[PDB]
Paper text:
HAstV is a nonenveloped virus with a T=3 capsid and a positive-sense RNA genome. The capsid protein (CP) of HAstV is synthesized as a 90-kDa precursor (VP90) that can be divided into three linear domains: a conserved N-terminal domain, a hypervariable domain, and an acidic C-terminal domain. Maturation of HAstV requires proteolytic processing of the astrovirus CP both inside and outside the host cell, resulting in the removal of the C-terminal domain and the breakdown of the rest of the CP into three predominant protein species with molecular masses of ∼34, 27/29, and 25/26 kDa, respectively. VP34 is derived from the conserved N-terminal domain (VP901–415), which comprises the capsid shell (i.e., the continuous, spherical capsid), whereas both VP27/29 and VP25/26 are from the hypervariable region with a different N terminus, which forms the capsid surface spike.
Numbering used by the authors: 77 to 331, 335 to 389, 399 to 412
């Protein structure tokens, strides 16, 4: 399949903040699916990309350059390493830093400038190179790759050796999306992408039962999910509560949440998928099933806890518009 059309785009995606744990922290997670990039200030060039993604059925990338620009000199700060990596299926990983080293990646030391260049062979989809555009399909064929940025090592003011607060790098992305095949339904889609600057989250679960995320009822995120979550639903499991067919990806860059086992790795990884639970509800907050992957969410297979349970800035993306 040769492309019908190829569209280049360039965007500024925000800053990589400094490290306070000393351990691995996630600082960005960038979906490349053409209907999932967000058109906002700094990214207006993604408007056409979304439009094409809604009108064609197959996409691929010609290339992908991610540029890191130092916002702070090496005379000033010390101690932190930044790792840019390619997540090929956009599926959360439990392997932390050493796993990131297995993927195609670039490390840059604080106070330095760099460009992570990717060849088409690194990005290709399973349909003779292509991915599918419609995010209601089987996920292994739709979502395609993601760029993740992680930091390792406490960021210290190089003079007083105290904790440094502030941005280390500016992220700029440049790529070109190719499209072919005609959307059976264009969908015109307008998927919500927003941020909830501060909100309090809790987790409940029990042995054999689904991990649940609670969000206060009048938070911006709880608000937006209830407005935009499809009224069509499904039933998990048994007895077993109904959940919207609309999925949301959640990414937490606020530095520390605890969960029922075995899912400490997931919340520390910083991003997962959720579906809104049907409730009254009550008691207090809105409630969300948590999912280990997009296909798990599409298939109504939530994360199942091994036991009971022993502050955040959320960035969220509507993955989904059910009807299909």
């Amino acid at each position: 399949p040769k492309p019908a059309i190829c569209q280049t785009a360039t965007a500024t995606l925000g800053t990589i903040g400094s490290n306070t744990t000393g351990a691995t922290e996630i600082e960005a997670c960038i979906l490349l699916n053409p209907v999932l990039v967000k058109d906002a200030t700094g990214s207006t060039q993604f408007g056409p990309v979304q439009a094409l993604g809604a009108q064609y059925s197959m996409w691929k990338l010609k290339y992908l350059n991610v540029r890191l620009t130092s916002m702070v000199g090496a005379s000033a700060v010390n101690g932190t390493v930044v790792r840019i990596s390619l997540n090929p299926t956009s599926t959360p990983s439990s392997t932390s830093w050493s796993g990131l080293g297995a993927r195609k990646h670039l490390d840059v030391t604080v106070g330095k400038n760099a460009v992570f260049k990717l060849k088409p062979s690194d990005l290709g989809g399973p349909r003779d190179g292509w991915w599918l555009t419609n995010t209601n399909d089987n996920a292994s064929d739709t979502l395609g790759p993601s760029i993740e940025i992680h930091t390792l090592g406490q960021t210290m003011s190089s003079y007083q050796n105290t904790q440094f607060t502030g941005g280390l790098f500016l992220v700029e992305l440049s790529s070109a999306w190719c499209f072919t095949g005609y959307a059976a339904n264009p969908n015109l889609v307008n998927l919500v992408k927003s941020t909830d600057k501060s909100v309090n989250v809790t987790f409940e679960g029990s042995a054999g039962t689904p991990l649940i995320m609670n969000v206060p009822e009048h938070s911006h995120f709880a608000r937006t999910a209830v407005e935009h979550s499809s009224l069509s639903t499904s039933l998990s499991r048994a007895g077993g509560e109904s959940s919207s067919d609309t999925v949301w990806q959640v990414l937490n860059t606020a530095v520390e949440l605890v969960t029922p086992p075995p899912f400490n790795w997931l919340v520390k990884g910083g991003w997962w998928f959720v579906k809104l639970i049907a409730g009254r509800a009550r008691t207090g907050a809105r409630r969300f099933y948590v999912y280990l992957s997009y296909q798990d969410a599409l298939s109504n297979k939530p994360a199942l806890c091994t036991g009971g349970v022993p502050r955040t800035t959320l960035q969220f993306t509507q993955m989904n518009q059910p009807s299909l």
